[PDB]
Amino acid sequence: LKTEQAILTPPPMVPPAINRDHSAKVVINLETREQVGRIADGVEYVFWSFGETVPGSFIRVREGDEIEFNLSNHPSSKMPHNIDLHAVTGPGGGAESSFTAPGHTSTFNFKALNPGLYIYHCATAPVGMHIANGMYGLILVEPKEGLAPVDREYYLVQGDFYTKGEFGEAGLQPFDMAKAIDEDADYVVFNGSVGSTTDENSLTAKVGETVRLYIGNGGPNLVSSFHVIGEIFDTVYVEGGSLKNHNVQTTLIPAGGAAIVEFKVEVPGTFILVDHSIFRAFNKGALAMLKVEGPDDHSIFTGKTAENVYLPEGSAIQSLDNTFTKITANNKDEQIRFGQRVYEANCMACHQANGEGIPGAFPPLAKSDYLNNNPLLGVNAIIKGLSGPIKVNNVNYNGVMPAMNLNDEDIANVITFVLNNWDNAGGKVSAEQVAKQR
Amino acid sequence: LKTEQAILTPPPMVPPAINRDHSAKVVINLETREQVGRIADGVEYVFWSFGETVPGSFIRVREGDEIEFNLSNHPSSKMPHNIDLHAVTGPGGGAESSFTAPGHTSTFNFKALNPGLYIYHCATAPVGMHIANGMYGLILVEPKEGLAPVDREYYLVQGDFYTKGEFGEAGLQPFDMAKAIDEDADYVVFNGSVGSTTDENSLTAKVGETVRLYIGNGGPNLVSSFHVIGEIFDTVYVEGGSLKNHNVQTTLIPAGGAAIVEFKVEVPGTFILVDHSIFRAFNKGALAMLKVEGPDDHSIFTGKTAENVYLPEGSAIQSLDNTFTKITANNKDEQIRFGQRVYEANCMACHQANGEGIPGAFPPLAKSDYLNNNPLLGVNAIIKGLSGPIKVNNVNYNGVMPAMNLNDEDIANVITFVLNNWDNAGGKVSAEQVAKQR
Amino acid sequence: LKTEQAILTPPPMVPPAINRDHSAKVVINLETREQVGRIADGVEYVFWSFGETVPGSFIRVREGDEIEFNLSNHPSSKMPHNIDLHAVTGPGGGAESSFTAPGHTSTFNFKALNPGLYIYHCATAPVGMHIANGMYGLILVEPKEGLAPVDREYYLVQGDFYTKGEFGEAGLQPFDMAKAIDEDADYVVFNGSVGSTTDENSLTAKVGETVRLYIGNGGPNLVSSFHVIGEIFDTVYVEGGSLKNHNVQTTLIPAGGAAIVEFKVEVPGTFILVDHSIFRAFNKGALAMLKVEGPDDHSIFTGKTAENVYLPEGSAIQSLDNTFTKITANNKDEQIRFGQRVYEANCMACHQANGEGIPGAFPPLAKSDYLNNNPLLGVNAIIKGLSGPIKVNNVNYNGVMPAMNLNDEDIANVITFVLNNWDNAGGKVSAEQVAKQR
Ligand code: HEM
Ligand code: HEM
Ligand code: HEM
């Protein structure tokens, strides 16, 4: 086996196809860095990265290659870093073997046993923090026979980011672990920032070309409903596996997962890669462009065209004139009818459509001496819950009704509804009577 | 090519199978509307829609058809509207070409190049708002050879809705973008409202029939774990693609995605379509019915039967009697043992099971002169974090320990635990000593 | 048909392969229990379960078997319980037919028509609560020809849990429905607790063995990005269906869904099953171990090895020294430039890059007499929204601009930017002028 140096490429670029009918020893040299970068216009963030970029450098090897993996951590790094590649068969995917303090180096070796497109990421405590700061990338293990040649290959990885400040707030934004743990992202992006791959930084192709996208999802947390606006995937390698799906509009990419999608571009214009959990795209930044140049094909698409729609919208909260006014019951008939709504929405699942309950389990509200003898017991049952021995129409019950957080109006109305149905005692209970039971 | 008028159907109905062995020019006329509708009993919402319904009218064409797409916006609309169909190969899926102010019309043309079941939706700023208000539907592009005939075809699309008020609050509810951006839905529904397709509005079939469901997910945000209670999918077209999976209980439908599922119904009764992220179904409204009529088959299923379970439950918070009481350490042995728990749960990932750390990266807590000489430094390290040059047992460290938001009791206990292990100095630190370090 | 007793196994164990070339009548006896168990060290929780464990007992049958299902509810249970098995063709998956009050029993019969690995769970109101308390398990319906023999079979089910207290808080923790409805989990676990299947409770195998995992996701709410650290799935049965995917790093398991994954273990060490929405694994508890014993294979993996990484981290919030300082504009040129950022991030999607808008829909900001004549109208448009008839450069508009929740500084800056572009009137608006418009 001859040794070769891996050619690593920054996103959105991909190394050339392997030019070997046989195995080699591949030497990889990757460094870990911590540095400030732009996350959106006017907003900065300390990105942690494999090789200077988020996602990290793309690695391309052949199934069966013997890999020497060298990780070096810059001395300016404050944290140790390591690597788990999903392409590795071995403990921690390399994590135990690549633990690298600032200024130091580690080396491990592995054979690439499985072809596919694999996420790699840092595996240093706090793991979610390292990953959330941008420490992820892709390694392609080509099948022995190689992949079909295509005209354009691009590398993108989606990530969710969590900042102390809100989206768009100017300044150097720190990581917010409270948001990250809650899975509540401020930014969702391809390739490390809002607008990383739009306008002059767009992916490019020409009419008639085949395009392949190597799409990863570094997470840490979110699952991508991955879609290209104005295109349909001719082929999807399902979850990056061997299975090929065709004619797919939108595919799910797991957190810590990847997929390969392919399509021929037949019409010129801008095609927009998004996470179709759609506020992530137009509000949080999960929007990249593929700009296709060449002659119109009016047999495929013809219409007015102007790049004045599908622009980024930001994350400010937009509101229309509010239409809501509180409604309260004014008389007994109205309490009964409002109460029926409360009953059917909240009580019926147990006590049933005609108040009959389920014998031995949920007692009847229909002709209930328990309720009729003191309607405030029905009020208390809702507010406080009801458990333990009770008697309803001389039948013993011993179940548990949960407390339910209904307001005074709803309780007053539902109890009034029940009292005026199913041969119960009639009368009514008011919201103020309920308030005083609290 | 002869021209034909597309027959558009409201949910849950589907147009008839294409009756052509060849291509046609298909003319579609679709209008956009804004109008109040019911979202749950007593609750109203301003739905924005393609053709009057949420989801919009179903469109059925054949692969290779030349489509003339006409969109008209009613003059009562306050907003412009447009359309992106996932079936279109072309910029914006038609969005740039169909931008239609109230009272106006737009026309574009496209060829349906890819067979499948495709989401369409509005693409007008604010995009998430337009989609969240109900502007989505499905277009079926039949394969040239057509689909197998089945006895029943139904159209459903799941959507997540975001209201200023809580679930079930009577009144005209406005859209809440703050909730939408956070992906925190008040309602999750099929076909535009809670109970849209239950009881008298159920889907129907007869024992022995084959049923096909065209199921979309308009989002905007949520991914559906789509399941039919009491049934198993005989076939799933994976993510709406060419790939067929069989014997699937539950399938993921991406936001802005779709799938076709098929099953033969062999037993009578009510079968319940749900999103199996299960609070969405029984609490938030993602519950539709397929009622199957015909003779029992006791060789397949026999049991007591009564439609008194799996009823809608509403979204009120139910609580059982609370069992929780705060626990604090009463003596040194107890502080040590409680501290061991805090240590193993929060500190060990770096400082290791026996306090040895990782040389050069995480300093030892075992026989730590740094801690033993002033235990309050350990307290401060947790409260404030610790970074920069330190010395531990004459070894230099320069790492960064994050601040960790542990309370006074937990800090006091973990520091006491460490002091009483690994040949450290003993003694203890109290919660009040920790409080005063803050 | 001979009758046989189902052998039910507790997690992570699986019953032996069916030893029959033909159908049988299989009798299942399962009980429902409510009891306190550990959820994490020092933390207890009342688990509700089928047979004593979370997940419940594993059931293994053959396609075509006639099943008699007996459910018995212990008299110490406070709640009724029932069962919906996804393997059943019939109403409620058995739910209507198995409703069992404490001290009681129910029986129903069904034929297992579809092979696969199926979730079962409780279906008693409140359904989400019963499921969230641990009431789920798996039933395997073997295909008639059986599954390939493997060396190790293990049973795991992921669940999300919701407690009143925060992760790790000592005591008996009650279920928190408010968190559950919001899908905001405190714990995410395999097999019912943090550390259920780590250390001495790890899964085990030997180098060279084939391992099959029957992996379910009981939810109630979350979807698992299921991954085994240091391994690649040789085969995945997609969503538990007939379709086989190969060489998959991470697969999505739907809530109320399952999958079978297989891999040969070729290197010794600890391999870590996780949900790769990665904070769930290292912080919330979704971390199980498979420990593989045997000789090293240095041709596959060679590196330093020490089980000092990928340790559980707990859910305390960790923070690095905060780098953020608020920035405000000091002069007109700076207001203009800061305003350009606000403009491009929040306004451009409608009013366009050069302020031209879209004729008839979004009015121009370029040379806008409306704004130039009273810049405070631009301020008000943002704060309050703007709707109804207006006139811009003698052109009538009647659209609706949403209110947008921008702060005083951002509004002052964006209006100043607009005034100083596109032949507008110049001048400026200050943050204090904006404040007073509120
Ligand atoms: C706001 C909606 C509800 C109303 C108005 C309501 C009403 C009542 C009333 C008046 C009683 C006293 C006994 C009787 O008259 O039969 C009762 C008890 C009971 N309810 Fe409800 N209920 C509601 C919700 C629910 C729900 C959703 C469940 C099922 C999770 C439930 C289960 C029970 C049980 C088990 C008891 C007996 C408790 C014992 O034996 O101590 N209830 N309810
Ligand atoms: C509440 C749990 C923790 C306790 C009780 C604890 C304790 C301490 C103590 C007493 C020191 C001072 C030096 C020494 O005595 O060795 C220290 C420093 C340090 N710890 Fe922790 N620690 C905890 C959590 C963590 C975690 C989770 C990490 C890894 C993310 C970490 C990483 C470090 C580092 C890097 C230093 C050295 C800082 C410098 O060089 O300025 N610690 N810790
Ligand atoms: C903070 C960002 C924004 C600024 C500075 C801004 C500015 C203005 C101004 C000054 C006007 C008054 C008319 C004119 O001068 O042309 C106006 C009106 C209008 N804007 Fe905006 N705008 C912003 C955001 C948006 C967005 C995002 C939309 C689209 C969802 C929008 C849609 C409209 C419409 C429809 C009107 C006319 C309202 C009517 O006819 O009553 N604006 N805007």
Ligand SMILES: OC[C@H]1O[C@@](CO)(O[C@H]2O[C@H](CO)[C@@H](O)[C@H](O)[C@H]2O)[C@@H](O)[C@@H]1O
């Ligand atoms: O002794 C730990 C110390 O050595 C370094 C290299 O200088 O890392 C070595 O030890 C790690 C943990 O065992 C290995 O994963 C790694 O391969 C090896 O180089 C420093 O990074 C570390 O602080």
Ligand SMILES: OC[C@H]1O[C@@](CO)(O[C@H]2O[C@H](CO)[C@@H](O)[C@H](O)[C@H]2O)[C@@H](O)[C@@H]1O
């Ligand atoms: O001039 C914009 C104005 O014209 C209308 C039709 O009255 O829309 C036209 O312009 C749109 C944007 O370029 C096209 O997408 C559309 O096809 C075309 O009819 C109005 O809708 C719009 O306000």
Ligand SMILES: OC[C@H]1O[C@@](CO)(O[C@H]2O[C@H](CO)[C@@H](O)[C@H](O)[C@H]2O)[C@@H](O)[C@@H]1O
């Ligand atoms: O009468 C309801 C009462 O009977 C029990 C058995 O004691 O359950 C029976 O009724 C259920 C509801 O119809 C059936 O699903 C079940 O098969 C049947 O045994 C009790 O559980 C219930 O409280």
Ligand SMILES: [Cu+2]
């Ligand atoms: Cu790192």
Ligand SMILES: [Cu+2]
């Ligand atoms: Cu990983």
Ligand SMILES: [Cu+2]
């Ligand atoms: Cu619209």
Ligand SMILES: [Cu+2]
């Ligand atoms: Cu779309």
Ligand SMILES: [Cu+2]
């Ligand atoms: Cu139960």
Ligand SMILES: [Cu+2]
């Ligand atoms: Cu289920």
